[PDB]
Tab-separated table of C-alpha atoms and ligand atoms in Angstrom:
chain	number	residue	atom	x	y	z
A	1	UNK	CA	-52.928	33.596	-222.591
A	2	UNK	CA	-53.484	29.825	-221.861
A	3	UNK	CA	-57.072	29.114	-220.505
A	4	UNK	CA	-57.459	27.691	-217.951
A	5	UNK	CA	-54.206	29.327	-216.751
A	6	UNK	CA	-52.204	26.853	-214.664
A	7	UNK	CA	-50.502	28.049	-211.465
A	8	UNK	CA	-47.711	26.079	-209.762
A	9	UNK	CA	-46.535	26.108	-206.111
A	10	UNK	CA	-43.353	24.103	-205.405
A	11	UNK	CA	-42.865	22.679	-201.912
A	12	UNK	CA	-40.864	19.931	-200.205
A	13	UNK	CA	-42.833	16.696	-199.603
A	14	UNK	CA	-41.980	17.098	-195.851
A	15	UNK	CA	-44.501	20.031	-195.828
A	16	UNK	CA	-47.426	17.973	-197.315
A	17	UNK	CA	-48.692	16.538	-193.966
A	18	UNK	CA	-48.959	20.108	-192.520
A	19	UNK	CA	-50.791	21.340	-195.647
A	20	UNK	CA	-53.279	18.411	-195.506
A	21	UNK	CA	-53.796	18.705	-191.704
A	22	UNK	CA	-54.629	22.461	-192.021
A	23	UNK	CA	-56.453	21.921	-195.365
A	24	UNK	CA	-54.519	24.870	-196.855
A	25	UNK	CA	-51.226	26.513	-197.695
A	26	UNK	CA	-50.614	29.531	-195.391
A	27	UNK	CA	-48.784	32.727	-196.506
A	28	UNK	CA	-45.298	33.238	-194.940
A	29	UNK	CA	-46.683	35.980	-192.592
A	30	UNK	CA	-49.461	33.566	-191.393
A	31	UNK	CA	-46.771	31.228	-189.862
A	32	UNK	CA	-47.212	27.925	-191.777
A	33	UNK	CA	-45.804	24.891	-189.900
A	34	UNK	CA	-43.123	24.468	-192.649
A	35	UNK	CA	-40.612	21.574	-192.343
A	36	UNK	CA	-38.403	22.755	-195.281
A	37	UNK	CA	-38.157	26.248	-196.881
A	38	UNK	CA	-36.399	26.689	-200.250
A	39	UNK	CA	-35.531	30.380	-199.885
A	40	UNK	CA	-31.980	31.544	-200.790
A	41	UNK	CA	-42.103	44.511	-200.729
A	42	UNK	CA	-45.542	46.228	-200.855
A	43	UNK	CA	-48.456	44.963	-203.019
A	44	UNK	CA	-50.011	48.131	-204.560
A	45	UNK	CA	-53.351	46.399	-205.488
A	46	UNK	CA	-56.060	45.637	-202.885
A	47	UNK	CA	-56.027	43.848	-200.552
A	48	UNK	CA	-52.524	45.380	-200.228
A	49	UNK	CA	-50.012	44.341	-197.535
A	50	UNK	CA	-46.677	42.752	-198.639
A	51	UNK	CA	-45.726	39.757	-200.853
A	52	UNK	CA	-45.321	37.450	-197.785
A	53	UNK	CA	-49.041	38.091	-196.911
A	54	UNK	CA	-49.891	35.925	-199.994
A	55	UNK	CA	-49.382	32.270	-200.966
A	56	UNK	CA	-47.292	32.537	-204.164
A	57	UNK	CA	-47.413	30.510	-207.416
A	58	UNK	CA	-45.482	30.692	-210.678
A	59	UNK	CA	-47.101	30.377	-214.135
A	60	UNK	CA	-44.626	27.632	-215.207
A	61	UNK	CA	-43.207	24.415	-213.812
A	62	UNK	CA	-39.409	23.878	-214.189
A	63	UNK	CA	-39.017	27.410	-212.701
A	64	UNK	CA	-35.809	29.351	-212.048
A	65	UNK	CA	-36.477	28.712	-208.296
A	66	UNK	CA	-36.428	24.958	-209.072
A	67	UNK	CA	-33.127	25.440	-210.972
A	68	UNK	CA	-31.683	27.172	-207.852
A	69	UNK	CA	-32.786	24.120	-205.772
A	70	UNK	CA	-31.360	21.701	-208.409
A	71	UNK	CA	-28.070	23.650	-208.434
A	72	UNK	CA	-27.718	23.824	-204.568
A	73	UNK	CA	-27.972	27.697	-204.683
A	74	UNK	CA	-30.523	27.516	-201.781
A	75	UNK	CA	-29.627	26.856	-198.086
A	76	UNK	CA	-31.701	23.667	-198.681
A	77	UNK	CA	-29.290	21.024	-200.170
A	78	UNK	CA	-31.704	18.075	-200.734
A	79	UNK	CA	-32.092	18.871	-204.465
A	80	UNK	CA	-35.147	18.593	-206.706
A	81	UNK	CA	-36.322	14.934	-206.132
A	82	UNK	CA	-38.414	15.705	-202.986
A	83	UNK	CA	-39.918	18.918	-204.484
A	84	UNK	CA	-43.608	18.654	-205.431
A	85	UNK	CA	-45.359	20.833	-207.996
A	86	UNK	CA	-48.857	21.649	-206.639
A	87	UNK	CA	-51.030	22.610	-209.653
A	88	UNK	CA	-54.207	24.749	-209.733
A	89	UNK	CA	-55.516	27.499	-212.047
A	90	UNK	CA	-56.029	31.266	-211.817
A	91	UNK	CA	-59.695	30.743	-212.901
A	92	UNK	CA	-60.333	28.280	-210.002
A	93	UNK	CA	-59.139	30.945	-207.502
A	94	UNK	CA	-61.488	33.565	-209.026
A	95	UNK	CA	-64.377	31.036	-209.148
A	96	UNK	CA	-63.779	30.191	-205.447
A	97	UNK	CA	-64.163	33.928	-204.558
A	98	UNK	CA	-60.632	34.311	-203.107
A	99	UNK	CA	-58.702	37.613	-203.267
A	100	UNK	CA	-55.632	37.454	-205.530
A	101	UNK	CA	-53.138	39.665	-207.332
A	102	UNK	CA	-50.539	38.708	-209.922
A	103	UNK	CA	-47.267	40.185	-211.169
A	104	UNK	CA	-45.251	40.231	-214.424
A	105	UNK	CA	-41.964	39.487	-212.452
A	106	UNK	CA	-40.704	39.184	-208.791
A	107	UNK	CA	-42.710	41.947	-206.965
A	108	UNK	CA	-39.579	43.298	-205.175
A	109	UNK	CA	-38.364	44.684	-208.578
A	110	UNK	CA	-39.117	48.456	-208.881
A	111	UNK	CA	-40.550	47.964	-212.455
A	112	UNK	CA	-42.828	45.034	-211.360
A	113	UNK	CA	-46.458	45.520	-212.496
A	114	UNK	CA	-49.361	44.218	-210.352
A	115	UNK	CA	-52.833	43.204	-211.642
A	116	UNK	CA	-56.077	41.813	-210.192
A	117	UNK	CA	-58.205	41.088	-213.345
A	118	UNK	CA	-57.720	37.797	-215.265
A	119	UNK	CA	-57.974	39.735	-218.587
A	120	UNK	CA	-54.621	41.385	-217.580
A	121	UNK	CA	-52.861	37.971	-217.876
A	122	UNK	CA	-52.253	39.352	-221.454
A	123	UNK	CA	-49.743	41.889	-219.906
A	124	UNK	CA	-47.316	39.094	-218.836
A	125	UNK	CA	-44.353	37.912	-220.966
A	126	UNK	CA	-45.664	34.404	-221.946
A	127	UNK	CA	-42.578	33.883	-224.185
A	128	UNK	CA	-40.397	34.119	-221.008
A	129	UNK	CA	-42.861	32.140	-218.800
A	130	UNK	CA	-43.082	29.205	-221.286
A	131	UNK	CA	-39.372	29.297	-222.354
A	132	UNK	CA	-37.257	26.099	-221.986
A	133	UNK	CA	-34.157	28.200	-222.877
A	134	UNK	CA	-34.000	31.200	-220.486
A	135	UNK	CA	-30.210	31.680	-219.882
A	136	UNK	CA	-29.968	34.964	-221.867
A	137	UNK	CA	-30.916	37.731	-222.105
A	138	UNK	CA	-31.070	38.326	-218.314
A	139	UNK	CA	-34.651	39.693	-218.523
A	140	UNK	CA	-35.955	36.182	-219.464
A	141	UNK	CA	-35.140	34.877	-215.935
A	142	UNK	CA	-36.860	38.012	-214.449
A	143	UNK	CA	-40.088	37.773	-216.538
A	144	UNK	CA	-40.254	33.934	-216.140
A	145	UNK	CA	-40.862	34.621	-212.395
A	146	UNK	CA	-44.270	36.310	-212.921
A	147	UNK	CA	-46.288	35.199	-209.833
A	148	UNK	CA	-49.940	34.565	-208.905
A	149	UNK	CA	-50.515	35.646	-205.257
A	150	UNK	CA	-53.471	34.393	-203.152
A	151	UNK	CA	-54.103	36.445	-199.992
A	152	UNK	CA	-53.432	34.801	-196.558
A	153	UNK	CA	-54.253	31.166	-197.448
A	154	UNK	CA	-54.840	28.811	-200.356
A	155	UNK	CA	-57.234	25.893	-199.805
A	156	UNK	CA	-55.834	22.401	-200.477
A	157	UNK	CA	-59.033	21.419	-202.382
A	158	UNK	CA	-58.077	23.914	-205.182
A	159	UNK	CA	-55.073	21.629	-206.064
A	160	UNK	CA	-55.965	19.589	-209.255
A	161	UNK	CA	-52.611	17.715	-209.594
A	162	UNK	CA	-49.428	16.914	-207.645
A	163	UNK	CA	-46.496	16.473	-210.078
A	164	UNK	CA	-43.392	14.587	-208.830
A	165	UNK	CA	-39.861	13.833	-210.094
A	166	UNK	CA	-39.920	10.020	-209.475
A	167	UNK	CA	-42.020	6.901	-208.832
A	168	UNK	CA	-40.688	6.700	-205.233
A	169	UNK	CA	-41.840	10.285	-204.445
A	170	UNK	CA	-45.225	9.660	-206.174
A	171	UNK	CA	-45.683	6.656	-203.874
A	172	UNK	CA	-44.693	8.694	-200.766
A	173	UNK	CA	-47.263	11.388	-201.763
A	174	UNK	CA	-50.046	8.743	-201.997
A	175	UNK	CA	-49.022	7.345	-198.543
A	176	UNK	CA	-49.399	10.876	-197.040
A	177	UNK	CA	-52.730	11.561	-198.860
A	178	UNK	CA	-54.086	8.258	-197.437
A	179	UNK	CA	-53.371	9.546	-193.833
A	180	UNK	CA	-56.014	12.286	-194.563
A	181	UNK	CA	-58.921	10.384	-196.173
A	182	UNK	CA	-61.141	13.528	-195.756
A	183	UNK	CA	-58.636	15.639	-197.862
A	184	UNK	CA	-59.143	15.909	-201.668
A	185	UNK	CA	-56.957	13.302	-203.434
A	186	UNK	CA	-55.707	15.036	-206.601
A	187	UNK	CA	-54.045	13.021	-209.391
A	188	UNK	CA	-50.343	12.300	-208.780
A	189	UNK	CA	-48.241	12.406	-212.006
A	190	UNK	CA	-44.510	11.713	-212.621
A	191	UNK	CA	-43.399	14.658	-214.853
A	192	UNK	CA	-39.616	14.428	-215.402
A	193	UNK	CA	-40.044	17.177	-218.071
A	194	UNK	CA	-41.029	19.646	-215.247
A	195	UNK	CA	-37.598	19.047	-213.572
A	196	UNK	CA	-33.931	19.570	-214.534
B	201	CNA	N1	-42.969	28.111	-203.585
B	201	CNA	C1	-43.258	28.647	-204.758
B	201	CNA	O1	-43.694	27.988	-205.705
B	201	CNA	C2	-43.017	30.126	-204.926
B	201	CNA	C3	-43.634	30.846	-205.945
B	201	CNA	C4	-43.373	32.189	-206.059
B	201	CNA	C5	-42.505	32.796	-205.185
B	201	CNA	N2	-41.929	32.138	-204.161
B	201	CNA	C6	-41.060	32.860	-203.178
B	201	CNA	C7	-39.624	32.275	-203.114
B	201	CNA	C8	-39.202	32.295	-201.633
B	201	CNA	C9	-38.979	30.912	-201.068
B	201	CNA	O2	-40.168	30.127	-201.386
B	201	CNA	P1	-40.830	29.183	-200.285
B	201	CNA	O3	-39.840	28.283	-199.643
B	201	CNA	O4	-42.075	28.649	-200.931
B	201	CNA	O5	-41.319	30.260	-199.221
B	201	CNA	P2	-41.208	30.548	-197.651
B	201	CNA	O6	-39.745	30.709	-197.324
B	201	CNA	O7	-42.138	31.664	-197.327
B	201	CNA	O8	-41.656	29.246	-196.913
B	201	CNA	C10	-43.063	28.917	-196.776
B	201	CNA	C11	-43.158	27.427	-196.874
B	201	CNA	O9	-44.274	26.931	-196.096
B	201	CNA	C12	-44.938	25.947	-196.857
B	201	CNA	N3	-46.294	25.798	-196.342
B	201	CNA	C13	-47.392	26.589	-196.552
B	201	CNA	N4	-48.448	26.216	-195.873
B	201	CNA	C14	-48.018	25.114	-195.152
B	201	CNA	C15	-48.673	24.257	-194.254
B	201	CNA	N5	-49.967	24.355	-193.941
B	201	CNA	N6	-47.929	23.288	-193.679
B	201	CNA	C16	-46.661	23.145	-194.069
B	201	CNA	N7	-45.935	23.892	-194.892
B	201	CNA	C17	-46.687	24.865	-195.418
B	201	CNA	C18	-44.823	26.440	-198.291
B	201	CNA	O10	-45.125	25.442	-199.239
B	201	CNA	C19	-43.349	26.853	-198.288
B	201	CNA	O11	-42.475	25.741	-198.401
B	201	CNA	C20	-40.306	33.076	-200.887
B	201	CNA	O12	-39.963	34.466	-200.834
B	201	CNA	C21	-41.564	32.804	-201.721
B	201	CNA	O13	-42.554	33.800	-201.464
B	201	CNA	C22	-42.179	30.784	-204.027
């Protein structure tokens, strides 16, 4: 498995002020003050609960979820340009002492496997996760959506990089970061190769 093991959370730039003000991402069930959601299940490892009790990450950028945004398949119609990739690592979460679990596919699938030890990152399909071509077979899309789940909240200061589609969005991100001079200022990188 890649070490450190990057984890990616995609979110609309309109959510960044709320993340910086709270100093964290909040799990769905912890009522984040979201401005845009990009939406179109029990967790059997401790600390248990359901998927929406965790802040979720993928193990790749340019995810199938981002393709659904790009293709207008979400209720959200603003497309990929305003969507940030927030980058951290699985090892940082462990080092910070935060409870996590991770899956080998979307956890709602009956055959989904759940893990809580970093050595079990070997159980994931890294061919699917890292694939640039994932149209067929259908299982590639499923296994590409392996997720890293952090219970209840994810501190902003674990984010190492904000990746953006364009110069204009990179500049907007820096304007927002400068409104919270106490908040960690990660590097901001234009990564067109992480988008469609
Ligand atoms: N976003 C991802 O990278 C990702 C990864 C894995 C799975 N998923 C699932 C795909 C599906 C839709 O995703 P999404 O729109 O992220 O989930 P969601 O519909 O649960 O909406 C939560 C939203 O709140 C945002 N948010 C969190 N904390 C704050 C805060 N402090 N202030 C402002 N906004 C905040 C978060 O970034 C996200 O946009 C959900 O079922 C997710 O669990 C998403």
